[PDB]
Amino acid sequence: ETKCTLKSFTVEKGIYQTSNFRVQPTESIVRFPNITNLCPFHEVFNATTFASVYAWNRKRISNCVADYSVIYNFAPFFAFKCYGVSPTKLNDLCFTNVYADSFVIRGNEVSQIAPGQTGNIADYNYKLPDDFTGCVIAWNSNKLDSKPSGNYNYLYRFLRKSKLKPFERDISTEIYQAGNKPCNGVAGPNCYSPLQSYGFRPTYGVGHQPYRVVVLSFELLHAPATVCGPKKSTNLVKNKCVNFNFNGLTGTGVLTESNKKFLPFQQFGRDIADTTDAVRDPQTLEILDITPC
Amino acid sequence: LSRLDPPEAEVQIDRLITGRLQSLQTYVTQQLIRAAEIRASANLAATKM
Amino acid sequence: QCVNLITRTQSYTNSFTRGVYYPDKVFRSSVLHSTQDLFLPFFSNVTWFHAIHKRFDNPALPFNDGVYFASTEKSNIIRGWIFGTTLDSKTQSLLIVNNATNVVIKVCEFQFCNDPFLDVYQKNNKSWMESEFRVYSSANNCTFEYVSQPFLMDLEGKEGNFKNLREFVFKNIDGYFKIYSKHTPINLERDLPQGFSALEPLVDLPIGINITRFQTLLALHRSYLTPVDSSSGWTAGAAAYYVGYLQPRTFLLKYNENGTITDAVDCALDPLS
Numbered sequence: 001e002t003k004c005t006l007k008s009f010t011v012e013k014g015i016y017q018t019s020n021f022r023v024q025p026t027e028s029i030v031r032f033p034n035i036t037n038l039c040p041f042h043e044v045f046n047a048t049t050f051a052s053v054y055a056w057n058r059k060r061i062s063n064c065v066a067d068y069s070v071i072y073n074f075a076p077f078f079a080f081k082c083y084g085v086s087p088t089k090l091n092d093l094c095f096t097n098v099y100a101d102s103f104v105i106r107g108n109e110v111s112q113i114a115p116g117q118t119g120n121i122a123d124y125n126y127k128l129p130d131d132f133t134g135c136v137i138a139w140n141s142n143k144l145d146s147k148p149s150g151n152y153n154y155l156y157r158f159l160r161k162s163k164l165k166p167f168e169r170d171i172s173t174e175i176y177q178a179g180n181k182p183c184n185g186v187a188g189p190n191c192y193s194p195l196q197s198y199g200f201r202p203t204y205g206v207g208h209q210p211y212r213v214v215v216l217s218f219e220l221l222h223a224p225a226t227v228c229g230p231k232k233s234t235n236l237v238k239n240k241c242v243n244f245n246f247n248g249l250t251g252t253g254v255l256t257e258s259n260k261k262f263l264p265f266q267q268f269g270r271d272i273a274d275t276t277d278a279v280r281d282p283q284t285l286e287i288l289d290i291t292p293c
Numbered sequence: 294l295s296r297l298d299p300p301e302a303e304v305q306i307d308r309l310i311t312g313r314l315q316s317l318q319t320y321v322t323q324q325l326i327r328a329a330e331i332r333a334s335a336n337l338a339a340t341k342m
Numbered sequence: 343q344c345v346n347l348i349t350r351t352q353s354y355t356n357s358f359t360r361g362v363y364y365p366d367k368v369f370r371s372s373v374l375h376s377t378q379d380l381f382l383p384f385f386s387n388v389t390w391f392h393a394i395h396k397r398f399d400n401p402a403l404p405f406n407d408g409v410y411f412a413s414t415e416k417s418n419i420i421r422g423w424i425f426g427t428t429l430d431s432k433t434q435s436l437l438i439v440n441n442a443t444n445v446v447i448k449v450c451e452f453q454f455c456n457d458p459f460l461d462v463y464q465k466n467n468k469s470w471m472e473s474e475f476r477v478y479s480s481a482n483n484c485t486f487e488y489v490s491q492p493f494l495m496d497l498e499g500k501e502g503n504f505k506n507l508r509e510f511v512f513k514n515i516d517g518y519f520k521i522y523s524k525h526t527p528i529n530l531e532r533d534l535p536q537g538f539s540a541l542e543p544l545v546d547l548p549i550g551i552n553i554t555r556f557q558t559l560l561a562l563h564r565s566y567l568t569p570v571d572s573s574s575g576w577t578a579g580a581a582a583y584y585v586g587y588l589q590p591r592t593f594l595l596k597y598n599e600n601g602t603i604t605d606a607v608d609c610a611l612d613p614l615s
């Protein structure tokens with residue numbers, strides 16, 4: 001390799017450079033809390049018929065350990081669009097909090113959810129967060145979503161004056177009053193009512209199908225958790241080059257007993273160099289430090 | 294890499310590499326000019342001794 | 343069950359150095375840091391409540407980008423906390439009630455009197471139990487309840503002097519309401535203490551609530567019964583406590599060998615700072 005670096009089949013004399021050692025992590029140790037309670041997701045996905053787009057029943061499921069199998073039992077999953085994350089890693093990491101807003105939209109605005117294009121949702125009716133860490137799933141249960149008699153209770157507002165702040169529920173009157181004449185709400189033709197219905201009877205086309213659209217809103221980098229699969233906090237190692245996982249953030253290093261003292265709520269121990277080198281277990285008080293491999 | 298995917302990763306994580314590269318270019322250029330003036334100062338010190 | 347007056351009042355003072363809450367669980371040791379969050383100004387010309395008291399207001403408290411609160415007393419003079427927009431069963435209302443047993447939290451849709459209360463004596467029973475429920479008493483179509491240990495020091499605070507001052511930070515980030523408080527051991531006994539302090543973070547509720555017009559309530563000794571004592575006899579003065587308003591500016595922080603804050607300065611101040 002010295003002949004290789006010198007680009008010749010001979011070397012002269014002395015000291016020459018090459019690669020480093022780069023000791024490898026021997027294993028990986030994950031630290032999770034000791035709380036595992038099963039969670040009934042049958043009360044949030046396959047319940048009765050949900051609301052229209054004019055109301056957002058923003059329901060937050062409580063803290064409950066739930067594997068991906070319960071969500072994965074639903075065959076007619078149809079929506080696959082995401083943003084920077086593949087939809088095949090919904091488990092093995094614990095998220096922050098689930099906002100599973102489950103409601104129904106008209107079937108010809110599924111492709112107009114994305115920003116940069118104003119549709120029936122991206123207009124003044126709704127303002128969505130720009131980052132949109134959460135995803136959209138939309139399965140169809142039209143065997144019982146639409147009654148044979150008809151479902152005319154689904155509404156939407158269309159015309160609005162001002163602008164809404166994103167991540168708000170838009171339920172108000174929002175009436176139209178203009179023109180070159182006194183109207184005062186009872187003018188007649190000067191009304192132009194912004195609220196309109198949908199109607200749902202099972203003789204339709206392709207953009208008229210109801211969907212149980214659940215938008216999942218969450219975030220990242222938040223110390224507790226709400227819903228994740230049952231994964232164990234494996235046994236720890238000492239002075240072992242290891243990939244440690246402190247509920248999220250991982251790294252490669254060895255463990256040392258921390259002589260210094262921390263506050264009970266200040267378990268995180270970042271330094272002036274802005275590196276994580278102090279941690280405790282989520283189950284037990286383990287005043288410890290980490291020095292990288 | 295925990296977030297993005299190999300069909301979609303490299304188009305986002307390319308500018309990180311370029312930014313680190315140009316930051317090291319600036320640091321190295323500063324190191325050369327500082328080393329040059331320190332070399333001149335050390336030559337002056339050698340002349341003085 | 344509602345006894346009210348239509349009289350409010352307000353006072354005025356000048357804070358110097360208060361409102362230092364820990365923003366994260368980091369253990370920074372003997373180093374410095376930059377902080378850009380909602381804080382009280384330094385030498386802030388803050389708003390006071392009247393030093394008298396027993397008195398009785400029905401005030402309107404404006405929530406303006408995070409709210410800092412301070413009260414030094416004995417025997418738990420202040421007991422209730424109502425935050426929200428309108429507090430009349432149409433917007434989300436966060437309710438904090440601090441008894442001696444276990445503090446209770448209700449993020450619910452509750453209408454209110456303009457000054458809800460409860461009157462407690464003993465009256466040959468040795469029980470200052472909740473006999474009056476002049477709060478909402480209806481509209482329980484809500485989706486929150488919580489029970490916690492009382493962080494607040496309880497009734498009948500027999501201590502050496504004005505031994506402890508309660509600082510509170512009510513802060514909201516993306517509908518996430520967090521209470522960062524401190525029951526600090528002050529010993530200066532003269533209005534605003536001239537000193538340095540820090541506030542630990544203890545309460546985080548990611549629920550979802552819009553707060554514009556909030557309030558702070560109490561539960562004290564008026565009558566224990568409607569007809570045993572004359573009503574409308576308590577003047578509009580409330581109690582002696584301080585309210586301050588935060589802002590997102592630049593500040594500098596210094597840590598110690600034990601990881602706590604020993605000094606901090608307002609980076610948006612006179613130019614030496």
